[PDB]
Amino acid sequence: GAPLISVKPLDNWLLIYTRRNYEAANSLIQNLFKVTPAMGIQMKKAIMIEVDDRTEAYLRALQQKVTSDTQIVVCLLSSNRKDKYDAIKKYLCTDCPTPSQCVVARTLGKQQTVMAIATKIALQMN
Amino acid sequence: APLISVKPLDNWLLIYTRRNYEAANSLIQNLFKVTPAMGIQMKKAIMIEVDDRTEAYLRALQQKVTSDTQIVVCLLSSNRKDKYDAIKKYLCTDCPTPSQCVVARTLGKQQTVMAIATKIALQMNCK
């Protein structure tokens, strides 16, 4: 036979992060692996993009890596630094057609933060 | 004391223009119908009538969106690209509260209603 239960594969997506948060990025992938089956989603590993911690490096990585095939984009930020956050958000929102979201590394400890992120992804996949 | 847990949706905004006053009322009623199956207990939206121009939508947003606002829904007279794009962009850059735009025309389907409610159930779990 072959599966009967609907899943949605999340196989092509970007996680853009800065070296200081290398391990909070890895943990996020694992955690999302845990909560994602309950939501009808089958996850592959994110395409991971390490950038210098500056606005412009995030934006470059965006212009170079986002494709037709990219399903979701997640920008992990070192900090809730208003200007950096606002300038990435503005660009994703005007220039990036691919659904996206920003996350501040700090909040990542919490399992409610993880759930919210996955929820937003489930949402963007429709 | 009532044992089944429900997510109350008691503070939220519907911004619409006078021409779609009734399509707006209907949308509330219909959402009342399909929302209990999703674990949500709905109150009526705070309804905000605005003139049919981009800027009027944006003023309403700046004035009425609060810490308490759970969801924002902008119902548009038309799929007019510029108006739709400008409102979408602004919500997306300047409005932290989760939101969506709906074109009145499409409200004439129970699949449209389901999609909006689905999106809301989803937005009720976000940071």
Residue numbers in the entry:
A (entry chain C): 485 to 610
B (entry chain A): 486 to 612
From the paper:
Argonautes can be classified into two major clades: AGO and PIWI. The PIWI clade, on the other hand, is restricted to animals and further confined to the gonads, often displaying strong sex-specific expression patterns. Together with their 24- to 30-nt Piwi-interacting RNAs (piRNAs), they control transposon activity and are essential for fertility in animals. Argonautes are structurally organized into N-terminal, PAZ, middle (MID), and PIWI domains.
To extend these studies, we crystallized the MID domain (S480-E616) of mouse MIWI, which binds primary piRNAs with a strong 1U-bias (∼90%). The final structure was refined to 2.3 Å-resolution using the native data. The overall structure of the MIWI MID domain reveals a Rossmann fold composed of alternating β-strands and α-helices that form a pocket capable of accommodating a single nucleotide. The MIWI MID domain is characterized by a core four-stranded β-sheet flanked by four α-helices. It strongly resembles those found in prokaryotic and eukaryotic AGO proteins; nevertheless, the superimposition of MIWI and hAgo2 MID domains highlights differences in the orientation of several secondary structural elements and loops. The main difference occurs in the position of the specificity loop, which forces the base to change orientation. Docked AMP can also enter the binding pocket and makes a stacking interaction with Y569 but fails to engage N564 in the specificity loop via hydrogen bonding, as seen with docked UMP. Thus, our docking studies suggest that the MIWI MID domain can optimally accommodate a 5′ uridine in the nucleotide-binding pocket, conferring an inherent ability to the protein in accumulating 1U-containing RNAs.
